[PDB]
Amino acid sequence: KENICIVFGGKSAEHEVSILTAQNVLNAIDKDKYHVDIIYITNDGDWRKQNNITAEIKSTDELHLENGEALEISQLLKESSSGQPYDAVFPLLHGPNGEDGTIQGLFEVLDVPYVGNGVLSAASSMDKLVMKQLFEHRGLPQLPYISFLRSEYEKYEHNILKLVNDKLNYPVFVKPANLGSSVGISKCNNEAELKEGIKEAFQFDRKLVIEQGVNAREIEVAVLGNDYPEATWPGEVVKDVAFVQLQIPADLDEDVQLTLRNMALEAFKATDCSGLVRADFFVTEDNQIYINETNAMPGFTAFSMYPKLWENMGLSYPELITKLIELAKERHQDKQKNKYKIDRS
Amino acid sequence: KENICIVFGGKSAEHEVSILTAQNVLNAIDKDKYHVDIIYITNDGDWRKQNNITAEIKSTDELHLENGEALEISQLLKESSSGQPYDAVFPLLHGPNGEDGTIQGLFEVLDVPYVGNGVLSAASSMDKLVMKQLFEHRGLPQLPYISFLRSEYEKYEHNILKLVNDKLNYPVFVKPANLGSSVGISKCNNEAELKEGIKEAFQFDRKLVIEQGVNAREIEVAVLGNDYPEATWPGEVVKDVAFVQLQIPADLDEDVQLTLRNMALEAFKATDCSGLVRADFFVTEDNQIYINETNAMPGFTAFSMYPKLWENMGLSYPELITKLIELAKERHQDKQKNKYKIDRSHH
Ligand SMILES: Nc1ncnc2c1ncn2[C@@H]1O[C@H](COP(=O)(O)OP(=O)(O)O)[C@@H](O)[C@H]1O
Ligand SMILES: Nc1ncnc2c1ncn2[C@@H]1O[C@H](COP(=O)(O)OP(=O)(O)O)[C@@H](O)[C@H]1O
Ligand SMILES: [Mg+2]
């Protein structure tokens, strides 16, 4: 029997999705094969541990949450309540406080084997600009964009707006580079607008992307692997306007589907991901494809896109979960073979 | 008065150099400005805290702590000897177990303010391939190079070897992407030597970079700041054979030295550094410039290049230290000041 720990919660108000996912994930683990502990991270940033989940979880009362063992962050986060080192820890708490990448650093320092993206790829995909430079270098098509720091806008305001207006068709989107799923995003149909959208954006962040806008369907691909990743067929959110229901496989040409699969595999490598990523694309009417973002820790509930896409290929939710754990162990072991092989030269 | 923590050691090859640097920093720090605590981390993850340093440490063996404050990592970083949170934690230690950016991660999670680069920047400057992609997008000159993963190498050996000849000129250097200033590196004068190098490196790493060897000088620039960084004049690492000794300022003509100062500033932004970076360049006898690498946590001894290049601009070692601490404060306060603003607006 193996030992697992699910870390969840977080400082965010994406807190409650984090609890739901924890629930789904716990109930899809075969307790006859896995010893599971969980750690909950409060809004205020405290860590609470509950030991040895063995029953099914029918609701949130059954989670102790804030009233677990007040846990000091320590060597012990490596130790399971069976008495044994954790074979894998599963962080289900999106892009924490500071940034994604941070908690993965905590685990690396503590030498705890964890599921998913490591530091570079989790950090790089929380940063919209770096992410875009890596996809460009990998050759992936993307909408036209411009970026700059606050300090650069403070002394080249005329130049920057000329650049926008010259290489970019309104409407454009202003996006803070370092926040996910959030604030400072504004549609700008003209320079007056643009100018205040940037002003708006810079109350929250030091770094912006300005992006040319399109009408597209949003299409998504799940990938799973370490060195030999595999990609799903794509799926989409079922709608008639780009201005919850899901279509898997997405309604698209056979070839557009292959292309998107391959792009997703290339996007995975561009960021040097481990475990998983979800690659999200914009696909226009005449099938022009643009990569929008990769997502290092995507929605992972029972009905989340990322799980449903693997269901399309006969990998059920529990098997997905087991597979992510084996990929976590594989990865931790190759690191230790290298950390050792290194030290002996 | 302000509360500071020096955290030094590691599990690393450079463990003693980390101790040496701790002594350097502890002695230049004005104990009439800062209360100072120290966290020793041995090559066993045996974190040890010692409070309130107010003495001018003579040997580097004083820094081999026999014991820590009993508490766990979390208690040791969230409170200073004085009881309030730290103004600034100064990591003088690489960050072992999957290398740099990790200990920063730790500090972010405990919400502790710290000196030097962030997660993304410390991680990027350790991945030579990602670093190189950011320098390229930014417009900086680089030596011809080819990168690939182990799996690409097992699928397509031939075609890559072909490319190496089609693009590079021997001798080439084979470099692992993710190991630090470490082995697995090699010059390779021919395809048989390249073949072995691929092999040697793949034992330590799953991703490599092959780069055109050059003949050039080793020329380094020191950068300091957050959003409004400044760069020093260059210095040269002086050696009759590349396979210690500094000339500050470097014997280079003026526009060249002007070009490198600005190139350092661009390198700092390509990787989105904070606090400091040391930009390393290759300059040919023909005054041809290529950036080799940036270094997020350069040597920081009293004799090291980075500190010395600041000395040349009139910023002494104690001031330099005081300045990295203030930068670490501004950057923490800035983050937190954005956090509250984000929380505030409810559309
Ligand atoms: N260039 C664009 N064209 C059309 N819609 C966009 C564009 N950029 C962003 N959006 C819309 O805003 C949403 C958020 O942008 P995205 O880049 O996905 O950032 P995040 O999802 O990290 O907040 C997207 O789902 C998309 O519909
Ligand atoms: N392409 C090259 N041509 C000539 N010399 C090189 C080349 N690449 C590396 N070297 C030498 O090897 C040394 C170490 O490698 P470097 O690229 O600086 O990374 P690191 O210090 O992380 O090992 C350098 O000090 C440099 O002088
Ligand atoms: Mg070097």
Curated annotation (Swiss-Prot), chain A:
Annotated PROSITE patterns: ATP_GRASP, DALA_DALA_LIGASE_1, DALA_DALA_LIGASE_2
GO biological process entries: cell wall organization; peptidoglycan biosynthetic process; regulation of cell shape
Cofactor: Mg(2+); Mn(2+)
Pathway: Cell wall biogenesis; peptidoglycan biosynthesis
Record's GO cellular component terms: cytosol
Highest taxon, organism lineage: Bacteria
Protein name: D-alanine--D-alanine ligase
Organism: Staphylococcus aureus (strain COL)
Gene from which this protein is expressed: ddl
